[PDB]
Amino acid sequence: MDWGTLQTILGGVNKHSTSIGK
Numbered sequence: 001m002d003w004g005t006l007q008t009i010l011g012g013v014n015k016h017s018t019s020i021g022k
Contacts, residue, residue: 007013009020 008016013020
């Protein structure tokens with residue numbers, strides 16, 4: 001995944017605020 005976009009986007013992280021997905 002060229003990862004490094006996970007911790008920020010992750011497989012499904014929800015510990016962050018609404019700003020991910022589409």
